[PDB]
Each structure stands twice: as C-alpha cells, then as structure tokens.
Amino acid sequence: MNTVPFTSAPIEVTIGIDQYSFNVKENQPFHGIKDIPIGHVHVIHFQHADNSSMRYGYWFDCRMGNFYIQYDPKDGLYKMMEERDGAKFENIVHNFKERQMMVSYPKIDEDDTWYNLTEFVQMDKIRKIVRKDENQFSYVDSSMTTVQENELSDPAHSLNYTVINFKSREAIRPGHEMEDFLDKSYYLNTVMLQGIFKNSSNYFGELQFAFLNAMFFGNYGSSLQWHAMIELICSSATVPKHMLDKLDEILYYQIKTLPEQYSDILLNERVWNICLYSSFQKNSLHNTEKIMENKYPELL
Amino acid sequence: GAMNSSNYAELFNNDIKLFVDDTNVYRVTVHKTFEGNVATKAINGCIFTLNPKTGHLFLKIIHTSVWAGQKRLSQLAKWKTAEEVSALVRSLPKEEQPKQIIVTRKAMLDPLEVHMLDFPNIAIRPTELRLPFSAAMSIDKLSDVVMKATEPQMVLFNIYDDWLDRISSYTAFSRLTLLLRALKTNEESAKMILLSDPTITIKSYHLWPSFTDEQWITIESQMRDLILTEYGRKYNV
C-alpha cells in the first residue's frame, strides 16, 4: 500500500480519491492519504470550497514514483509533485502515519468497483492522451478541450483522445458508402482496432478514461468521447464476441457508479436508446440494459 | 443551412446549384398474388436533378434491373440516388460543378453527404419549400423516355424550353412550380388546360406549348383557378 502525503491544506477543499470524496476545512491536521491500493492507476481530485469553478486533479500510479501534494498560493491550486529523495519521502510519510494525520483509502474488502472501472486503463496511455512529458502524473480539469473539440484552443493543454467521426473519409471506404455508413464494422475493426489502437484492451482503456474524466471533472469533451466509443461498437454488425461481453461489464460498472443526480448531464439519451434498442448490438448488452432500465428508466 | 422563402432569391444568383428530388427513383405497383398475398412490381424511375437558374435538367433514368435481388429497396434508393448525383458531379468540368446541392427530402441528406465527402466545399442542404417535382412524370415527354428505357440512361433537358429568352429565372421557376403543382393536384384538368387549344403546339424540341406572353398569363390564371378549385373540393370550402 502506497501514500500521497500533503505538505498542508491551506484552503478549504473537497478532496476526491478515485470514487471517494471527503472535506478538509481551511486549516486542520490534514497530511494526506494512505493505504492506496498498489496495482491500479488512481486519480486525486479537488474542488475548492470557495470556488467550485474548476474541478481539477491528477492521474498517477504509485509504482512510478513518490508523489505528494502541495498548495501553490500564486497559481491558487493544489499541485502534485514528485519527490526524488526516497529517504526523505519515507521519513515524512512515517511521521505523518505515526501521527494519524493521513485519511485511509476507504476500500471495502468485497469491493472491486475501482478495478472494474480501470481494468484496461494504463498510466502510459494516459500520458499519451494528456501531454506533459516532464511529469510522471497527468493533470486534468473540467475545462480542458479535446483535439476534436479544437478542430471544430491551446494545443498543449488538450485531451488527445482518438478522433471518431462517422462522416469522415477515414470512416467510409470509397465505393462502400452505404455499407460503411450503416455498418461501422470496417471503421471499428480495421481502422480503429487493427490500425490505431492495435487491440481491444487499448480501446477499452481510452473508453474507461474518458468516462472517468467526464464523471470526476464534468469534462464535456470526455463525455462526448465515451459515448462515441460506445456507439462505434454498438453500430457495428461484426464485433468479436469477447469484446461485446467485456463492454457489457465495463458499462454495467460505469452506470452503477454514476451519481444518480448527474444522470441528466452525463448520459446522452439518443446514444443510449439507439445502442440498447435499435443498434446491431441491441441484444448483446444484457447486464447494462438491465441496470439502465432499473436505475434510469426516465432516459429510456 | 436549410433553404426557405426568406433566402428564396438565392436560387437565382450566380452560384451554381442543383435541386435533387428522389421521389420517383423507386416506383412500384402493389397487387394481389395468386395465393392472396400482396406483392410489388417495380417500374422504371428517375432522379430529377435541376439547375433552377438555367433550367438544365439531368434526368437519370433508373431501370428496374437495378433492384434485382436487392433488399430494403426504399433505403437502397436513397443511396443509389446519392451515388448517381456524386457520379454526375464528378463527370462535370470543375467550373460547372455546383457549389450547393439542395435535396427536396431530408432523408437524402446523409446519403448525399457521405457520397460527397470528397467535395468538402459543396454544401448539401435541405429546403423548407414544398416543391412539386414528383409531378415531373406528368410531363409527357419525360414519362415517355423513362418508361421506354431498357437500360440505365441519362437524358438532358431544359425544363424551361425557351422561356429565359423572355423572362427571368425567378419567373421561370415560379411558372414551373405552378405548372407542376397543378399537374400534381389534378393532372387531367391541368393537361386539359395546357392542350385544350389545338392551334398552340409543343415544338419537337420542347416540353411545353409555345404560348405567347399573353397566353402564358391566361394559362397561369387557369392553373391557379384549378389549384383553388381543388382546394375547395378537398376541404368543402
């Protein structure tokens, strides 16, 4: 188990760690988060009490380095940093732990939620979507735009998701216009899977990352990407059976974790009704259809 | 975007544009089978592609053999329409290619957009005009060439005959639409009006009769009266 210490908490803030969130008041003995499960990526995120504008946060993997948080009063945010002095870091963490000044990552033994949401998500792939090569962790916030959003404006601060566009020459073979528009299998299997992603695990990783950025930051371009990647699969008549079964599991856990009160803003009615009831794969997502119909029957 | 009565004069500016109407591409008769089921029999159709400024009509005749062994024909017909319009554009010299293509039915937007991805500068637009181009098969010379066709064929016409020698394209289009609306609403009476007078004939190289300016005024009034008469018959007014 690993630890993200905090130098201090100078401003009141709601702190998220993966799907958990807790409040720290403007000066308390708060010195970080311990018992973080090794083996997964994690996200530590922030919403300031006095300015809910900008949710922001950091994707990281404790196996890649020793990371801590320190408030910057000039830029007005909690910043992640790497500590290269390993003996310094271990002594700092030991003291805060001996002082019970860290909150515990509050994982229930039975609870596989975080694994089920991040099964295919890798730090290396996150760092290609979020380009800041001098850091081992990746900053994301509520307002960052995607490369596709920019094409339709600072490129260094963008989310470089893979562009999906159903009415593009990439999606449609000359001479197969009707075929490729009504059946996206070419675009899914040859262009995206064989061509760009190389395998379904990298596809699912980006799909999962997009969902998590939409949910944790309210990032609109991420929500668009998540729905695009779902619709691309559901609108293909030919999908490997293992991908369909895995997608059903992926979506089930995403819908199960979504806060009920954010459903109006995180779920696209058109995409979900098309995917569950009209698409080629309308009968292939039994777990996802069951939870959607019991939890969000209004959207359907 | 969409094309309506606000920007109506845009039709007659100097930006080349075409209307495309697909309503006569897939045509069928419905009949009973010997077992008492119902079956369709296709008949020859056409794509109606018109330059409203010049009157040039590119009539692609759709021969029934294009449907043989195909499924979902009403959907196929939209994509075949789009394929043929794309092929027409590619066949034209660059300086004759349209800058806009206006589809009379919104279901043609995606098929035409997908076929024209190679022409990102040609705008594909719907219209809020209700244009009576389905009645083109009430023009005898057009119906004749479609029904006689034994294979796919493109035939070129000028749907305004020689009218642009005497009137603007705005007025020619308004005359065409009134004529086609009348033929759509009551074909028999409209053809009665157009042909009643034997001393006014259709030139071999024309589609409509050789009316003088004064006779066109009379004809147009008679067509409006027909439309109005039919409106009153329909709604009991």
Ligand SMILES: O=C(O)/C=C/c1ccc(N2CCCC2=O)cc1
């Ligand atoms: O929002 C909540 O429900 C809890 C908030 C919370 C709980 C515990 C702490 N701790 C633990 C170590 C020192 C410290 O300050 C800080 C916030």
